[PDB]
Symmetry: C9
Subunit: 137 residues, 9 copies
């Protein structure tokens, strides 16, 4: 009723189950039975936990993490963009397969422009959010 129960009742409530069903699914989890009031006590308890206010350094944690979310995605998209631009040249020469024998998938030229715009969008998002971190905080 401390860690893996207070987490589970909160997570199962936010996916839209009434506290009757939250009890019945957890009635067979570990215990013999879980009463509805046992569920409903935790939901009101965890409500006030979530009702707290952040700190100024607490906000700096996500803005640190959100920009690092971006850099992981740019390592993925630039790997795609190079490997998509590979298929555009090999399609143009008429090669049905790459020299590695791997198949050549068709890529339109307006599709490469889409992935170019996605990358520079992310790179522009770093500059804007980092500047607001300096400005607001």
């Amino acid at each position: 009723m401390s860690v893996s129960f207070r987490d589970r009742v909160l997570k199962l409530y936010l996916l839209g189950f009434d506290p009757s069903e939250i009890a019945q699914t957890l009635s067979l989890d570990a215990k013999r039975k879980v009463t509805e009031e046992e569920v409903l006590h935790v939901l009101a308890e965890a409500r006030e936990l979530l009702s707290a206010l952040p700190s100024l350094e607490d906000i700096r944690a996500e803005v640190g993490q959100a920009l690092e979310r971006a850099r992981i995605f740019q390592k993925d998209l630039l790997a795609i963009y190079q490997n998509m631009l590979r298929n555009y040249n090999a399609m143009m020469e008429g090669l049905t397969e790459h020299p590695d024998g791997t198949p050549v998938i068709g890529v339109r030229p307006a599709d490469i422009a889409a992935m170019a715009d996605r990358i520079m969008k992310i790179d522009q998002e770093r500059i804007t959010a980092l500047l607001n971190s300096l400005k607001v905080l």
Copy 2:
């Protein structure tokens, strides 16, 4: 006429039934019959319940819950994004199936960029709403 009746008459009204039909569907629910005035008394009664004003800590409850709605969805989408990026590499190599024998589903490169944008949208929504929670409240 206290809990499972006042809830039901309100929920059935907001789905757009006239109080005649709300009576007739609940005429066979528990009682022998439910009069229309018995229904219409509750709807005017629960109208003033809903007409109340929130509190400042009451608003902090949803903003706590709305950001926690986000974190449950990011645990889902990042699980998709990894398992979608798995299918992109295995399609490129020409593997009809994964080494686990599971089939390989085709994924366009502009589709991965869509799921990348959905995730960083949610992550940006946490920063904006949490800052307004500090600013307004």
Copy 3:
């Protein structure tokens, strides 16, 4: 000419019937005949009923009801989202049917991101409208 007539003449007028046709459809409803002036008197009468101004607590009634419209819809969409995310995992494993024998319907990964965005849109609408209820009223 009190309840089920003044309602009917107003509702039939706003669906775009001239008062001649409003008379003729209601000429065979209950009475032997309904004159056009009998119809047109009620429309001018109910015009001034609708021309009234609301009260400040009257506006609080809909804002109470509009947010409760949202919570009924989130109970529906989250039930879909869980049962749509069920079909995505079972499609990935290659199961043509669920272990319950029910068929597996194909779900694209960009479709799950659509239902994720609809839910958090509604949840953000509660925060904005409830805050304006505190601010304006």
Copy 4:
């Protein structure tokens, strides 16, 4: 030349007929013939009728009627939404027909989210327009 003629000449002009054709179509309506100047006199006459200014209570008439237009449409869409959500559950179970024998029509989950957004759009339109009625008027 009083009621059913001044209405007809105005309505036929605004559908884009020159006053020659307005005469000729009404030349065979009731009279032996209708001269063009007989038509053109009425159009200049009814021009100044339409050129009048509204009153403040006159504007309150439509704002009363426009919100009542909304409530008639919500009685229709919520009837659709329930009867569309019926088809989604019965499609999921694999029932080709309903237990009433009626056919089951396919509904995508992103389509239910469309009708959910249409309803709460209308409900939000009531709050905005009613508040402006209190604010401006």
Copy 5:
């Protein structure tokens, strides 16, 4: 060179004919020939007619007529909307034809929501334009 010539030369010019072709098409209309200078004199003459400024009551004429354009269109769309909502119920019951024997045309539920939004758009346009007529004029 007064009415049906000054109108024709202006209308034919604004559809993008050079004054040579305006002459030649009207060279065979009524006269033996029409010189280019005869055309070009009228175009410069009617230019200054169009170059005039409106009056304040002149603007009130169109705003009267523009709102009456709306009411003619709402009489059409509401006639469609009722007769489209007829086909939705009869499609749902499985009736290939109406009880009148007329065929049943398929209507998607998101299509009814489109016509609902068009109507309330027009009704909202009356309130905005009529209020500006009171405000500006």
Copy 6:
């Protein structure tokens, strides 16, 4: 080198021909040959003609003509809209042909709403531009 040459060199330049090609196409037009400097002198000459500033009554000429462009187009679209709404009723009754024997072309109900919106857009453009003509000028 006065009228039909200074017009032609300007029009052919703005369609993107270098002055070499402007010379060569006009080298065979009338003269034996046209030198490049003969072309390039006119382009610099007509450059300063276009570089002039308008007058206040000069701007009133187009605003007169632009609104008259609108009225010609509304005479066309309203002729379409009536003749499109003819095909919608005759399709609904099941008539493969009109009583004139002309074929019946299929019209969706959302298409009629498109032409309704185009017309009232144009009618709203007259009110806005005419008011700015009174306001600015």
Copy 7:
């Protein structure tokens, strides 16, 4: 190294060739060879030519030319619009060919509304840009 070389090196650079390739393509153009420094000297030279500032009458040249670009395009589109509206009437009558024997191409009514909107967009662009020419300059 004066006219047809300084133009060519600038035009070939802005299409994205490194100065090595600009040399090699022009190595076989006229001369025996063109060194890279011969290319790179011109690019730095023409850089400062482009780095100059305009004059106030210089800006009036393009605004003169940009509006004249519009009038050439309206002579084209109005020629299309008349010849597209020809095909709409002849399709409606059922004529597979025109009386000239030319084929009849199918035109939807929403397509004519597109070309109507393009023309009045251009005509509105003349009024806005010409007024700014009076206002700014």
Copy 8:
């Protein structure tokens, strides 16, 4: 626990693994086992690393790099645009293959206008971001 471990635990956490799974995947990486507290200590440690604030010269690093991201992409798109405009001319002449024997791929004229707009979008992004670098910094 210094470089290739603190990087890996952070990168694997931001892809949405709970610290139990981060331990188990790295339990077989190098060590015999990695405890959950060993993982969770690093995540709280690296949280404060990311929680730091940037410097003013630190922001100048990305704005330098973001504009250099643009120039690499323009070297790619201009190479496409020339080699796409090659296929448009050769398609127009009717050449199924290029004179090099390479196949001719079909290009619509509205597609070339898309790549033209992408390039000048990027070129306009350099001017805006570089000016803000002068303005803000």
Copy 9:
């Protein structure tokens, strides 16, 4: 380690290779081997090169070049627009081929309006950017 190495390490880094792979690809380029610290020294060195600030005349260089990018593209699109408008007239007459024997490609009338809008967009971009060059600089 001066020109073709500092350029290559920077360009290969911005395409998203870790400095290990930047070393290994350049380990076989010219030298026997390239250490990772040899790579990582240059990346930190070139970081401060990119971290510099522009000059006011430096910004005038791109704005000169960006407008000249436009004029090269208008020479291309106007060449397309004339040669697309050629195919529209020849399709209308029914000519399967041009008098030159070249094939006639089908062009919709709404497609010509697209290329008309692209050109006047570019021409409007010259006026706006050149005016800001006078205004800001």
